[PDB]
Every structure is written in C-alpha cells, then in structure tokens.
Design a protein around this ligand. Sequence first.
Ligand SMILES: O=C(Cn1nnc2ccccc21)N(Cc1ccsc1)c1ccc(-c2c[nH]cn2)cc1
Ligand SMILES: O=C(Cn1nnc2ccccc21)N(Cc1ccsc1)c1ccc(-c2c[nH]cn2)cc1
Lengths: 305, 305
Amino acid sequence: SGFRKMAFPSGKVEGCMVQVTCGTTTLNGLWLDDVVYCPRHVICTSEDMLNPNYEDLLIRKSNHNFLVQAGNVQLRVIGHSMQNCVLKLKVDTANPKTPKYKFVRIQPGQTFSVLACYNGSPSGVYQCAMRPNFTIKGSFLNGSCGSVGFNIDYDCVSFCYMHHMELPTGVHAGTDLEGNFYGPFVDRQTAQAAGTDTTITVNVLAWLYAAVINGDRWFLNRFTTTLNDFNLVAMKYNYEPLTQDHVDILGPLSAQTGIAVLDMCASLKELLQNGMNGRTILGSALLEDEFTPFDVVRQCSGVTF
Amino acid sequence: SGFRKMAFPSGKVEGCMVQVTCGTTTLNGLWLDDVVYCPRHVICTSEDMLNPNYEDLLIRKSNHNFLVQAGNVQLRVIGHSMQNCVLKLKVDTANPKTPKYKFVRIQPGQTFSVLACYNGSPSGVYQCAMRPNFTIKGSFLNGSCGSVGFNIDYDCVSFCYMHHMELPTGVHAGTDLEGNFYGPFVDRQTAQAAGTDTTITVNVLAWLYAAVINGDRWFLNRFTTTLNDFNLVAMKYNYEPLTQDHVDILGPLSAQTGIAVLDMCASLKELLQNGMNGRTILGSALLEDEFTPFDVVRQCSGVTF
Ligand SMILES: O=C(Cn1nnc2ccccc21)N(Cc1ccsc1)c1ccc(-c2c[nH]cn2)cc1
Ligand SMILES: O=C(Cn1nnc2ccccc21)N(Cc1ccsc1)c1ccc(-c2c[nH]cn2)cc1
C-alpha cells in the first residue's frame, strides 16, 4: 500500500527532447516524426519579449537560422511555420524514437507529468495539475521553456502542455501542443492577471477515498448531506462546485470503500467548517487536490505502461 | 522558480526492468549486462514465507525453473546464485540497453527515485528518502517487489535500493543491490518492528533554504543558537541531532541566501516550539524532510542528465 504523488515513466518522452537555438536564445523542443515543436519566443531577444510582433520577427528568419540538436546529432531544418504560439520546424529526419502519441487539450483539474528539461536534456519528472485558473504550480528555471507535460496510456503518449513562461506571481503558464495558451495568457512580458484560483473539489474527494483505502479513517463522520447543501459550503470555501458528473466519476471509489459519495461530501464539509485540528491525512496537514479520481484508481490498482 | 518533489528521468532504468517468474510467483528483476537481479523470495510459495530456509529452497530449483521475460521476448537463464537476499540469474544475453551503472549503499536521510513496476512494466516514478529507521514510505502493491531505487549522475545510474516487503505498519523495506537489507529487517513473513522514526533535521533545514530562495521568508529571524543548544530542543521533538558535517553540507545554501546555518537552526527551533500558526511553507503545512541539501541545490540550479 501507500500513496504518493506519482509521475508517469518518462522514457518515451526523454527520447523526443531536443535543443532548439535561434540566434542568441536557446530552449527545448519536442521532436515527433519529422517536426520539432517549440515555443515561438525562441525567435525573440530579451528586449523583444516586452512587446513582440511575432510575425515580423519570424519574417526575418530563414530555415538555417534554427539550430536543432538531438543529443549530438544535428538536425537539418527544411521548413518552419508558426501555429498560434508554437513554432513547427520541419526537419529532414523522422525521430526514430517517436512513440505512439496524441495532442490533447486537458480540462482544469486534470493532472499530467512534467519532464523538466534544460538545453534539450531531461533534468527531472514530477506530477502537476492544471489549476482552475489555468496556471500550474511547477518548478521551472530559466531555459526550461519547451518542456512538456503528458499522460501515458499503456504505449500512447498524450501530450497536453508545453511550458512558455513564469508569471510575476511565480506560477507558470503555457500552451497545448497546437500553441493555444491555457487561460488568458499571452507570450509577452507584461503583468497578466490569472483568475481567482479555487480548490478542485472532485480531486479532494478522490484523495479522501485514497486515505480510507490506506487506513486513514478518523475524518469519517456520521452526517450526510445533499449535493446542493454541500455546494453551498463549497462556494463559501472557494471550492469548485460538485456536479453529478463528478459524483459519477467517483463511483468506482465509492463502490470499493462502501462510502457513498454524498457521505464523503459530508465528511469534507466537516473538515472545511471545523478545520483539521492539527491532524493529518495521508501525511498531509492540508486538503490535497492534485490527485484525480483516475490517479487514485491507478495507484490503488497497479496500472502499467 | 518553484520547488517540487522531483524524481530523476527514469528512461535509463525502464530499459532494465524484466519480469521474473519462479513457478508460482512473479515479480520484477533488473537486467544489467548478462545478469538479472531480483528478490530471492521469488522462490517461495506463500506458506514458504512464514519461515523460509532459502538455501534448501534454492536447492530444489535449477536454472530452468526461472522464467525471465523482457517485453514479449523470453531470456535463457544459464546460471543462478544467491548473494544475501538477492537472486542473480545469469542470462545468455547482455542487456543492450544497459546504462553506465554503479551499485551503491546509501545512508539514512539520503534520497532516491523509485521506479514502481508490476510484471516487469514501469508504472510510475517518485522520490523517497531512506528514513532514519531504514524504512521508506513508498507506494507499492503486490507484484511491486523488485522495483528499484536509483540516483543519476549525468549518465551513470547509481542503483541503491531494491524493494522486498511491506511491513504490517504499511511502510516499506528492501535491500541494496548486493542483497543486504537496509535496517534490521529479514525476508521472512514474521512480525517485524521498525524503530522510532525521527525527522531528518539537515533535510528540513535544506528545505527552509529552498523556501527562502523561492520567496517564503516569514519564518526568518536573526535569533542565534549554538549547535549544542539547538540539539537540546531538536531531541525533544524527535529530530535527528545536527552535526558539524551537516553544517558543512549546508554551506553553499548558506552562502547563496546570506543566512548562516545556525541562524536557520534558530528559525527551526522557533517553528518546533511555536508551530507554524496556520501559515504554510512552499505549499505545505508540515515541515518537509525528504529533500537533501544536494536535492535543493540541484533543483535550484537546473542540473541535467
Ligand atoms: O518567464 C519567462 C521564461 N521562463 N519560464 N519559466 C521560467 C522560470 C524562471 C525564469 C524564467 C522563466 N520569461 C519572462 C516572460 C516572457 C513572456 S511572459 C513572461 C522569458 C524571459 C526571456 C525570454 C527570452 C526570449 N528570448 C530570449 N529570452 C523569454 C521568456
Ligand atoms: O510484503 C510482501 C510483498 N509486498 N511487498 N510490497 C507490498 C505491497 C503491498 C502488498 C504486498 C507487498 N510480503 C510479505 C513479506 C514478509 C517478509 S518479506 C515479504 C510477501 C507476500 C507474499 C510473498 C510471496 C512470495 N512467493 C509467493 N508469495 C512474498 C512477500
């Protein structure tokens, strides 16, 4: 048993990380088949970033202005184009290590693994949630741009995130692999407002189920509630509303533990109203909302890839 | 910026995970060169585990009762041997994906990445610390035995842990890659006791520096304390005593932040006595002790592999 924040094995993704340099700027790129994906701000100077005109900046670049290195292998760039906020660099060689993959745009509250990279070389792997305000609270240093987030299903890598920037608040923003930002953000160096962040209620409930499965039961109470009553309390504590679809998703966990979803909501409403009183749940003194229902089931079933 | 529990990229190790089956039991093995290492308890039936005589049990087996499978491919065992608590199966094929590797026995307080595996297939990756009582708090289900723990140094994989068993308390124990258990544990299904688990004091201090580097500074104060005075308070709270070697290890973080080690100990002293008063530190309401000073520096300077 046990329960940890757990990343997907990163091997299939390591094999796609390459280094992309343009003029003075270097960052990471993702090489799938014969195309290298990377953030378009690779074509900017530091002074450009204050207010970039991306199509005028890209006008000035030819194919040979793009240095793409895969390990020590130099890739020949034979085409370039901009799609929203990512550059696509057509290269003359298909990545022989390309996994089966898809590009997908996740929903707020869903989780993914981040393979942090620098100069095209993997540095570490960790799990992240897309917050309700479409930021992520990661660990990215200068040069980490182009690092990607992904989920794996057996042998298929679903790429869902490419890293573009750290906001002045110190949280992180990026795009899907078609270059569309998550949230209202743009790739310009200006202060930009992320919305009010909120707690991912369905994830908290899933984590409470993980706790019961692992023996932590002190928070189980003798009350119950309704979806509407609970949602009134959810709103008061800046928690995402809970929907019927969320109840349905929590179905398998409720069947395993014998605890009906609305009975777990009554437990949570009590932890919200009375606090945790210095007690812990699965080694944490705060309510944890970065495990989805699928993450919990994965880690209490043993799915492999 | 940001600070996360970050594992090493697991690619080099994924290519070494095989499935080992000895009659009834299946678990994971580690295929390096022409040897597959795995827990010796694979040769036990269920009832065998209550009181196994491993030498007599190994006699009843010869090279062909061991089914090693890599992906779909099956390997030919051509030699077997028992080094302490690990089996060594000689195969007729050197692993072409063998990375540069060392076998290493680590010290309590040090960390590593676990690649959790089932039926020889990687399932997830996460970071652990060898607790002072020589257990680890991992996430392991039946069939996870044989999963390994490791660190990476550029291109060389230092294997330090192989998983064997969950104790009745739900924490985990295992060996080095020479088969020597960490701690007082034995690979027999009898009630076993881990000692008192203390907090890794030098790791907590390292994480407070990580916190200052990332802008969480509220807990700071320019109170002083002697190493000796600090340990008197530490020992009351089940903190490991802080030695001078620990102060030396914390040197580089002291210099980057301009906060002397003993000044930080003074801040920890005040956090232990007066609690955190509902504030948080790096998104956590407890003091974290599973980051070494080396982990902090690596994540705050972007070491790549
Ligand atoms: O935020 C970034 C890039 N970035 N991403 N993760 C980071 C972690 C630590 C430091 C910087 C980080 N910026 C600032 C910015 C940009 C748009 S909105 C905010 C950044 C800084 C420099 C450059 C650049 C382009 N060409 C040369 N330098 C790009 C982004
Ligand atoms: O702990 C284990 C096996 N194990 N390891 N991590 C686990 C996580 C969840 C459930 C079981 C887990 N034991 C008990 C034990 C006591 C001393 S050493 C191992 C275990 C149970 C069965 C068997 C076995 C071997 N052959 C057939 N059954 C081995 C170990």
